[PDB]
Design a protein around this ligand. Structure first.
Ligand SMILES: O=C(O)CNC(=O)C(=O)O
Ligand SMILES: [Mg+2]
Ligand code: NI
Ligand SMILES: [Zn+2]
Length: 331
């Protein structure tokens, strides 16, 4: 078996290998990359996402989110308080202000220590889930707005045509902005490109050990667990690497820098934080290997999760027994 320790693998495709997206994902899996839950892909030196990022300041962040924490330094939840709209130029200025800027630090490890020590005492503002793309339309390789759709994948594999669309989302981050422990909707893959700015640190649990993380989360967030059998779908819970280690949860960590792709694999729980002002683009995707994960994916039906239009068809076709209950949660 390839990659039996479930390490995060890093790939350096050639420009020739970068032509066929599906083929390269399959190649990574042939080397055991999926066992980690997360892989890094460094594009060939000849590739670029777009010419320059000099003209992005007029993008609107319609609903910036202030991420307010509750709990203890290593075990906390966050809720999202809506703020007034601001442009990316305004957001960048805010990120760099004394109140929100990255503190002096020695290296990534020092900054990581500061993050887990101090995160809960601040409330950074995130521009998340903004529909759009920063890939040049002429970028032919690994253009996250030109991927084969999940709906077409499901049709190719299972023969059923379904409604729905999926398009990329932009994320504008600042120091301490946080993504909570989660797997993707329907345990899909995701791919994330860091366009510009400061790094993003990721934590990930191997898919084969995801239920260990779930069990710990139930113990650490007991009220939330009683409220919903899939409350990590709410994407609000954080658990530090120290607490994971104390509880014997297998995980890995890696820092993504500007110009690098990360792929998360089906049922790979992940969480992380931004180092400073940055912009990432991400989208969900599927492969034939995803279908069995989609069939088995947990669902939130308590009403909190509330997801995209396109998830309806996924649940309807892959999980018909769960569909009625899930849809009640939607409404
Ligand atoms: O970048 C973020 O804030 C969150 N991204 C993801 O969870 C992802 O790409 O799957
Ligand atoms: Mg602009
Ligand atoms: Ni994700
Ligand atoms: Zn729920």
């Amino acid at each position: 078996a390839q990659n039996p320790n479930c390490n995060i693998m890093i790939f350096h495709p050639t420009k020739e290998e970068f032509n066929d997206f599906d083929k390269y994902i399959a190649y990574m899996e042939s080397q055991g990359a999926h066992r980690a839950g997360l892989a890094k892909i460094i594009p060939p030196k000849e590739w670029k996402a777009r010419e320059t990022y000099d003209n992005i300041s007029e993008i609107l962040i319609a609903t910036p989110l202030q991420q307010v924490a509750s709990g203890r330094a290593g075990v906390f939840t966050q809720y999202h308080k809506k703020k007034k709209a601001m442009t990316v130029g305004e957001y960048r200025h805010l990120a760099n202000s004394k109140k929100y800027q990255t503190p002096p630090h020695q290296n990534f490890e020092d900054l990581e220590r500061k993050y887990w020590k101090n995160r809960i005492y601040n409330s950074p503002i995130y521009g998340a889930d903004i529909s759009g793309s920063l890939f040049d339309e002429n970028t032919k390789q690994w253009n996250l707005g030109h991927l084969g759709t999940i709906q077409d994948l499901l049709e190719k594999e299972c023969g059923v045509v379904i409604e729905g669309v999926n398009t990329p989302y932009l994320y504008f981050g600042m120091w301490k902005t946080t993504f909570a422990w989660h797997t993707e909707d329907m345990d899909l893959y995701s791919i994330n490109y860091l366009h510009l700015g400061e790094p993003k640190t990721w934590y990930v649990v191997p898919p084969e050990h995801g239920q260990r993380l779930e069990r710990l989360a139930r113990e650490l967030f007991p009220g939330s667990s009683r409220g919903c059998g899939a409350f990590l779908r709410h994407k609000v819970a954080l658990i530090s690497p120290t607490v994971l280690k104390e509880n014997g949860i297998p995980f890995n960590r890696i820092t993504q820098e500007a110009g690098e792709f990360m792929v998360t694999f089906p049922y790979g729980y992940h969480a992380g934080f931004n180092h400073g002002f940055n912009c990432a683009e991400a989208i969900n995707f599927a492969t034939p290997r995803w279908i069995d994960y989609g069939k088995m994916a947990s669902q939130c039906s308590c009403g909190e999760a509330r997801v995209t239009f396109s998830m309806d068809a996924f649940v309807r076709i892959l999980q018909p027994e769960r569909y009625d209950l899930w849809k009640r949660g939607q409404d």
